[PDB]
Design a protein around this ligand. Sequence first.
Ligand SMILES: Nc1ncnc2c1ncn2[C@@H]1O[C@H](COP(=O)(O)OP(=O)(O)OP(=O)(O)O)[C@@H](O)[C@H]1O
Ligand SMILES: Nc1ncnc2c1ncn2[C@@H]1O[C@H](COP(=O)(O)OP(=O)(O)OP(=O)(O)O)[C@@H](O)[C@H]1O
Ligand SMILES: Nc1ncnc2c1ncn2[C@@H]1O[C@H](COP(=O)(O)OP(=O)(O)OP(=O)(O)O)[C@@H](O)[C@H]1O
Lengths: 537, 107
Amino acid sequence: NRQSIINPDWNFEKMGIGGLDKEFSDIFRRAFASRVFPPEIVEQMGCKHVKGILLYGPPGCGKTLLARQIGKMLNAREPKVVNGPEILNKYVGESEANIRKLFADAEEEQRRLGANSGLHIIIFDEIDAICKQRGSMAGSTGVHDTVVNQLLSKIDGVEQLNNILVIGMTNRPDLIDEALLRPGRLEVKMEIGLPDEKGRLQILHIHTARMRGHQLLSADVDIKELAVETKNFSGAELEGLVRAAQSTAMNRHIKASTKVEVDMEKAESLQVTRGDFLASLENDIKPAFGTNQEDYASYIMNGIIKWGDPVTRVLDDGELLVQQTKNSDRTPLVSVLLEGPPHSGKTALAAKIAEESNFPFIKICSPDKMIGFSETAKCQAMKKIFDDAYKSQLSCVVVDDIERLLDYVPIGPRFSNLVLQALLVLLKKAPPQGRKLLIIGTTSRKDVLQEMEMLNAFSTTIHVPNIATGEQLLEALELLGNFKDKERTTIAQQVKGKKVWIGIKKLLMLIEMSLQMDPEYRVRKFLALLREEGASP
Amino acid sequence: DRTPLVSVLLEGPPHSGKTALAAKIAEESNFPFIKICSPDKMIGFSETAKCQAMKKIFDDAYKSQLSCVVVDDIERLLDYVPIGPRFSNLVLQALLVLLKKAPPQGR
Ligand SMILES: Nc1ncnc2c1ncn2[C@@H]1O[C@H](COP(=O)(O)OP(=O)(O)OP(=O)(O)O)[C@@H](O)[C@H]1O
Ligand SMILES: Nc1ncnc2c1ncn2[C@@H]1O[C@H](COP(=O)(O)OP(=O)(O)OP(=O)(O)O)[C@@H](O)[C@H]1O
Ligand SMILES: Nc1ncnc2c1ncn2[C@@H]1O[C@H](COP(=O)(O)OP(=O)(O)OP(=O)(O)O)[C@@H](O)[C@H]1O
């Protein structure tokens, strides 16, 4: 006999697994090298084969698809599939009999024909329902322990059986019995991670090819655009997106308020447009998990307007700092402080500076999540964030509204002390070797921080000014453009007399409040407001 | 549309009728969601209880597309007494945080 171990009519393309391919190459190299090679060389070498494969990873990836495909790829006895904990039975000693029934046939075949038999595949799905720790599973009955012991004794006992392949997949590997996770049993273990950009492109092509073939897909569709937009989608979500888009297109030809009807004409004219894809992205499907999903639209609701010189100066300084921290050896840690009068946009400029930087790891720590936290929880949250930041090669973090992060209030003073000591030490310590860290701080009250003796721990400070000249006020108004030229001249005629001191966050409020009155009283009302509230140096 | 959050502080001498003028304005609003967070419903609570209650009310108030909420007798909500003075710090930080948080988009 010259039985082959691979189906001659096989191709890696038809398997359709997408971005795993390096994982699949590793699996093949380890699991089947011993069998592909011709007999005499291995006979001389006398190398045993591996028996147990363990696949693990988060929900919705290849794993079941991959196991179904591996089972299909070989040309041998059909696999026997076990769907989770269907082994358990209500009589004493009925579980072990069931388990051994699986391997009985392989034992017999090996014993009869010797070393020239075929291959048998046993696929354990949801293996964590069975092989939980015998030292941890509930003490109410033996059966879980005796099942584990039966499996361990049978997979690699005193009698040597070396013609069986057992495949396992799970979600929480660390619970599995370590005596099962040792060479010669379940030995190769691999992580099926979330797909990268290229993998997304592959998956999309695989699911779109058939529709392409018949010219149902409209030519405007740009797959690469879709790939770029879709961040953290898994394979399952990537399929569901396409399904939802097709459904949105197909529904267009059905009536269903009165008794259902379908147009036998337009049934011939169906196509999917890119607009359906856009629509499905926001209404129907949402990606779970993922890292980022930042709502910068909530931190920077109005973008920026370059109402004068200082905005550019500030942004230039921030860019310089980023560039420096990018390429340096002596000083792997850099810390910058932003401060100025209240209502001056201190947060928006910080967030924009961060976003222009293109570091892989960008996170903002803010008190708005921490409402009612004790003096302990805050420490935990901060420690967690910085631990995360230390993993990635490059990381930039923003700590905003320090004064509210301390619970400061002027009557005592009163503040939390633990938080301040944690903040000082976390600012001081250097990151792990070869990584680099940037920290951007925001505060309203410089002098207080100076008093607490933490101003020194920052490397440098940046001053964010507010509007100082009436000319700048006029320019900011023009950039907003909420008033007509005649109103502009009317304002100018009086405003030019004296300088003004007002922060832009208050400017917007005043404008909005002024718009509410009748047209003939707007200007005057505005003026009155600017007069009454603007009294300040 | 550009000022999703608006705040107003009714103020005056004692025994003058602040709470009533206030709940009359809320009634005439005719908004979909209206709530009143008075201090007399939480007699004998500690700090964490108060924080949780207020947090719950605002979390529900973000679910309607528009809402009105009344916070009357601040002076009693945070336990102030002239001798000292003494007060709860936690409640005050809660207020100063919640007054500056924009709701979810479009609300
Ligand atoms: N890498 C991928 N390439 C192509 N299709 C994929 C990929 N990952 C998942 N899919 C598709 O999404 C679905 C994944 O189902 P599958 O059972 O493999 O997920 P799983 O996470 O292994 O299952 P479980 O939830 O039990 O862990 C299938 O429709 C499959 O075709
Ligand atoms: N040039 C600008 N710079 C910054 N923000 C601007 C500018 N023009 C308009 N804005 C808008 O004004 C808002 C000002 O409010 P914001 O909370 O950002 O300011 P802040 O100075 O950090 O606040 P606070 O005084 O509460 O600390 C910004 O969020 C942005 O929406
Ligand atoms: N024109 C009015 N304005 C306000 N309240 C009025 C008026 N006419 C009658 N009232 C009545 O006056 C009472 C005002 O009591 P209320 O509790 O509002 O006073 P308050 O000053 O808010 O209480 P406190 O002194 O404890 O703060 C209510 O019963 C209200 O109906």
